[PDB]
Amino acid sequence: DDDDKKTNWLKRIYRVRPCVKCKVAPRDWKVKNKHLRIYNMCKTCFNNSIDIGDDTYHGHVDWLMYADS
Amino acid sequence: DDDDKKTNWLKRIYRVRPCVKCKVAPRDWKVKNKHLRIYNMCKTCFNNSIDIGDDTYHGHVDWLMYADS
Ligand SMILES: Nc1ncnc2c1ncn2[C@@H]1O[C@H](COP(=O)(O)OP(=O)(O)OP(=O)(O)O)[C@@H](O)[C@H]1O
Ligand SMILES: Nc1ncnc2c1ncn2[C@@H]1O[C@H](COP(=O)(O)OP(=O)(O)OP(=O)(O)O)[C@@H](O)[C@H]1O
Ligand SMILES: [Cl-]
Ligand SMILES: [Zn+2]
Ligand SMILES: [Zn+2]
Protein backbone atom coordinates (compact mmCIF):
# COMPACT_ATOMS: atom_id res chain seq x y z
CA ASP A 1 0.00 0.00 0.00
CA ASP A 2 1.67 3.31 -1.03
CA ASP A 3 0.42 5.03 2.14
CA ASP A 4 2.57 2.51 4.01
CA LYS A 5 5.66 3.55 2.04
CA LYS A 6 5.06 7.15 3.21
CA THR A 7 4.44 6.11 6.85
CA ASN A 8 7.55 3.95 6.98
CA TRP A 9 9.67 6.75 5.52
CA LEU A 10 8.41 9.36 8.06
CA LYS A 11 9.14 6.90 10.92
CA ARG A 12 12.66 6.52 9.58
CA ILE A 13 13.11 10.28 8.96
CA TYR A 14 11.92 11.09 12.50
CA ARG A 15 14.18 8.41 14.07
CA VAL A 16 17.49 8.93 12.30
CA ARG A 17 17.90 12.73 12.52
CA PRO A 18 17.72 13.88 16.16
CA CYS A 19 17.52 17.42 17.55
CA VAL A 20 19.90 19.71 15.59
CA LYS A 21 21.13 21.24 18.88
CA CYS A 22 21.74 18.44 21.38
CA LYS A 23 22.01 15.86 18.60
CA VAL A 24 20.55 13.16 20.85
CA ALA A 25 16.86 13.70 21.74
CA PRO A 26 14.18 13.32 19.07
CA ARG A 27 12.56 16.48 17.61
CA ASP A 28 9.38 18.15 18.71
CA TRP A 29 6.56 17.89 16.13
CA LYS A 30 2.85 18.55 15.59
CA VAL A 31 0.22 17.35 13.16
CA LYS A 32 -1.75 19.91 11.17
CA ASN A 33 -4.32 18.86 8.60
CA LYS A 34 -2.66 16.26 6.43
CA HIS A 35 0.92 17.28 7.31
CA LEU A 36 3.46 16.33 9.94
CA ARG A 37 5.52 19.31 11.02
CA ILE A 38 8.90 18.16 12.40
CA TYR A 39 10.59 21.05 14.30
CA ASN A 40 14.35 21.29 14.21
CA MET A 41 14.88 20.87 18.00
CA CYS A 42 13.62 18.72 20.87
CA LYS A 43 11.45 20.74 23.32
CA THR A 44 14.23 21.02 25.94
CA CYS A 45 16.65 22.66 23.50
CA PHE A 46 13.91 24.84 22.00
CA ASN A 47 12.86 26.19 25.43
CA ASN A 48 16.52 26.81 26.30
CA SER A 49 17.06 28.62 22.94
CA ILE A 50 14.38 31.12 24.02
CA ASP A 51 16.15 31.69 27.38
CA ILE A 52 19.61 32.21 25.81
CA GLY A 53 18.22 34.36 22.95
CA ASP A 54 19.38 32.23 19.96
CA ASP A 55 17.04 31.82 16.96
CA THR A 56 19.74 30.01 14.88
CA TYR A 57 18.12 26.56 15.20
CA HIS A 58 14.48 27.67 15.03
CA GLY A 59 12.61 26.16 12.08
CA HIS A 60 10.77 23.10 10.79
CA VAL A 61 10.12 20.80 7.87
CA ASP A 62 6.57 19.81 6.92
CA TRP A 63 5.79 16.36 5.46
CA LEU A 64 2.65 15.14 3.68
CA MET A 65 1.45 12.14 5.75
CA TYR A 66 -0.14 10.25 2.80
CA ALA A 67 1.18 8.88 -0.52
CA ASP A 68 -1.18 10.79 -2.77
CA SER A 69 -1.37 14.54 -3.13
CA ASP B 1 18.01 26.67 5.44
CA ASP B 2 15.04 24.32 6.09
CA ASP B 3 14.31 24.04 2.35
CA ASP B 4 17.76 22.45 2.10
CA LYS B 5 16.84 19.82 4.70
CA LYS B 6 13.86 18.85 2.49
CA THR B 7 15.96 18.81 -0.72
CA ASN B 8 18.68 16.68 0.84
CA TRP B 9 16.12 14.21 2.17
CA LEU B 10 14.37 13.80 -1.24
CA LYS B 11 17.78 13.22 -2.90
CA ARG B 12 18.47 10.52 -0.34
CA ILE B 13 14.95 9.01 -0.61
CA TYR B 14 15.20 8.89 -4.42
CA ARG B 15 18.71 7.33 -4.32
CA VAL B 16 18.39 4.62 -1.69
CA ARG B 17 15.11 2.92 -2.74
CA PRO B 18 15.33 1.75 -6.36
CA CYS B 19 12.58 0.37 -8.61
CA VAL B 20 10.36 -2.04 -6.61
CA LYS B 21 10.43 -4.52 -9.52
CA CYS B 22 14.00 -4.79 -10.81
CA LYS B 23 15.41 -3.44 -7.54
CA VAL B 24 18.32 -1.81 -9.37
CA ALA B 25 17.29 1.12 -11.62
CA PRO B 26 16.05 4.37 -10.09
CA ARG B 27 12.30 5.16 -10.19
CA ASP B 28 10.44 7.19 -12.75
CA TRP B 29 9.10 10.51 -11.37
CA LYS B 30 7.45 13.78 -12.38
CA VAL B 31 7.06 17.20 -10.83
CA LYS B 32 3.57 18.64 -10.41
CA ASN B 33 3.01 21.99 -8.75
CA LYS B 34 4.97 21.94 -5.54
CA HIS B 35 5.19 18.12 -5.32
CA LEU B 36 7.58 15.46 -6.51
CA ARG B 37 5.76 12.30 -7.53
CA ILE B 38 8.07 9.27 -7.26
CA TYR B 39 6.52 6.28 -9.12
CA ASN B 40 7.15 2.81 -7.76
CA MET B 41 9.01 1.48 -10.86
CA CYS B 42 11.68 2.60 -13.32
CA LYS B 43 10.23 3.24 -16.83
CA THR B 44 11.55 -0.06 -18.26
CA CYS B 45 9.76 -2.16 -15.63
CA PHE B 46 6.62 -0.02 -15.83
CA ASN B 47 6.38 -0.42 -19.64
CA ASN B 48 6.97 -4.17 -19.27
CA SER B 49 4.26 -4.38 -16.55
CA ILE B 50 1.77 -3.08 -19.13
CA ASP B 51 2.86 -5.76 -21.65
CA ILE B 52 2.63 -8.65 -19.15
CA GLY B 53 -0.66 -7.36 -17.64
CA ASP B 54 0.48 -6.91 -13.99
CA ASP B 55 -0.77 -3.87 -12.03
CA THR B 56 0.74 -5.16 -8.72
CA TYR B 57 3.61 -2.63 -8.68
CA HIS B 58 1.70 0.34 -10.12
CA GLY B 59 1.58 3.31 -7.75
CA HIS B 60 3.45 6.35 -6.45
CA VAL B 61 4.35 8.47 -3.46
CA ASP B 62 4.08 12.26 -3.61
CA TRP B 63 6.50 14.51 -1.68
CA LEU B 64 6.24 18.23 -0.89
CA MET B 65 9.41 19.78 -2.38
CA TYR B 66 9.70 22.62 0.19
CA ALA B 67 10.06 22.76 4.00
CA ASP B 68 6.99 24.84 4.68
CA SER B 69 3.41 23.85 3.95
N1 LIG C 1 11.05 22.60 18.89
C2 LIG C 1 11.38 23.59 18.03
N3 LIG C 1 12.53 23.60 17.30
C4 LIG C 1 12.84 24.58 16.43
N5 LIG C 1 12.01 25.61 16.20
C6 LIG C 1 10.82 25.68 16.85
C7 LIG C 1 10.42 24.66 17.81
N8 LIG C 1 9.19 25.00 18.32
C9 LIG C 1 8.85 26.15 17.69
N10 LIG C 1 9.81 26.54 16.82
C11 LIG C 1 9.83 27.75 15.98
O12 LIG C 1 10.42 28.83 16.70
C13 LIG C 1 9.83 30.08 16.31
C14 LIG C 1 9.38 30.81 17.58
O15 LIG C 1 8.41 29.96 18.20
P16 LIG C 1 7.10 30.51 18.98
O17 LIG C 1 6.25 29.29 19.24
O18 LIG C 1 7.60 31.34 20.13
O19 LIG C 1 6.47 31.49 17.84
P20 LIG C 1 5.20 31.19 16.87
O21 LIG C 1 5.31 32.12 15.69
O22 LIG C 1 3.97 31.21 17.75
O23 LIG C 1 5.35 29.67 16.32
P24 LIG C 1 4.65 29.13 14.95
O25 LIG C 1 5.17 30.03 13.85
O26 LIG C 1 5.08 27.68 14.85
O27 LIG C 1 3.17 29.34 15.20
C28 LIG C 1 8.65 29.72 15.41
O29 LIG C 1 9.13 29.84 14.08
C30 LIG C 1 8.43 28.24 15.70
O31 LIG C 1 7.97 27.55 14.56
N1 LIG D 1 6.87 4.14 -13.48
C2 LIG D 1 5.74 3.74 -12.85
N3 LIG D 1 5.74 2.88 -11.79
C4 LIG D 1 4.62 2.50 -11.15
N5 LIG D 1 3.41 2.96 -11.52
C6 LIG D 1 3.30 3.85 -12.54
C7 LIG D 1 4.47 4.30 -13.28
N8 LIG D 1 4.06 5.17 -14.26
C9 LIG D 1 2.71 5.25 -14.12
N10 LIG D 1 2.28 4.48 -13.10
C11 LIG D 1 0.88 4.28 -12.66
O12 LIG D 1 0.30 3.19 -13.37
C13 LIG D 1 -1.10 3.41 -13.56
C14 LIG D 1 -1.41 3.24 -15.05
O15 LIG D 1 -0.65 4.23 -15.73
P16 LIG D 1 -1.18 5.03 -17.04
O17 LIG D 1 -0.18 6.13 -17.26
O18 LIG D 1 -1.40 3.99 -18.11
O19 LIG D 1 -2.62 5.58 -16.50
P20 LIG D 1 -2.98 7.08 -16.01
O21 LIG D 1 -4.22 6.98 -15.15
O22 LIG D 1 -2.97 7.95 -17.24
O23 LIG D 1 -1.77 7.60 -15.06
P24 LIG D 1 -1.93 8.77 -13.94
O25 LIG D 1 -3.02 8.28 -13.00
O26 LIG D 1 -0.56 8.89 -13.31
O27 LIG D 1 -2.38 9.97 -14.75
C28 LIG D 1 -1.37 4.83 -13.08
O29 LIG D 1 -1.84 4.70 -11.75
C30 LIG D 1 0.02 5.45 -13.03
O31 LIG D 1 0.12 6.40 -11.99
CL1 LIG E 1 6.05 14.82 2.01
ZN1 LIG F 1 17.79 18.90 21.87
ZN1 LIG G 1 12.85 -1.50 -12.78
Domains within chain A, CATH numbers bracketed? 1-69 (3.10.450.210)
> Which value in Å is the resolution of this experimental model?
2.0
In this structure, the residues whose C-beta lies within 6 A of any atom of ligand 2 are B 28, 39-41, 43, 46, 57-60
Which residue from A32, A35, A68 is facing B62, i.e. has the nearest CB?
A: A68
- Asked if A9's CB is within 8 angstroms of B35's CB, the reply is no
Residue B28 to residue B48: CA distance in whole angstroms: 14
**How far apart are the CA of A51 and the nearest CA of chain B, in angstroms?**
23
Optimal mutation site among B2, B10, B38, B40, interface A, most CBs of chain A within 10 A? B2
Q: In 10 A of CB B49, how many CB atoms?
A: 17
- H-helix or E-strand spanning residue A36: strand A35-39
Residue A26 to residue B22: CA distance in whole angstroms: 35
Identify the burial level of A6 via C-beta atoms within 10 angstroms of its C-beta, where 0-12 means exposed, 13-18 middle and 19 or more buried.
buried
Q: B7 alpha carbon to ligand 2 midpoint, in Å?
A: 25
Strand order in the sheet with A60-64: A29-32, A35-39, A60-64
Residue A61 to residue B64: CA distance in whole angstroms: 10
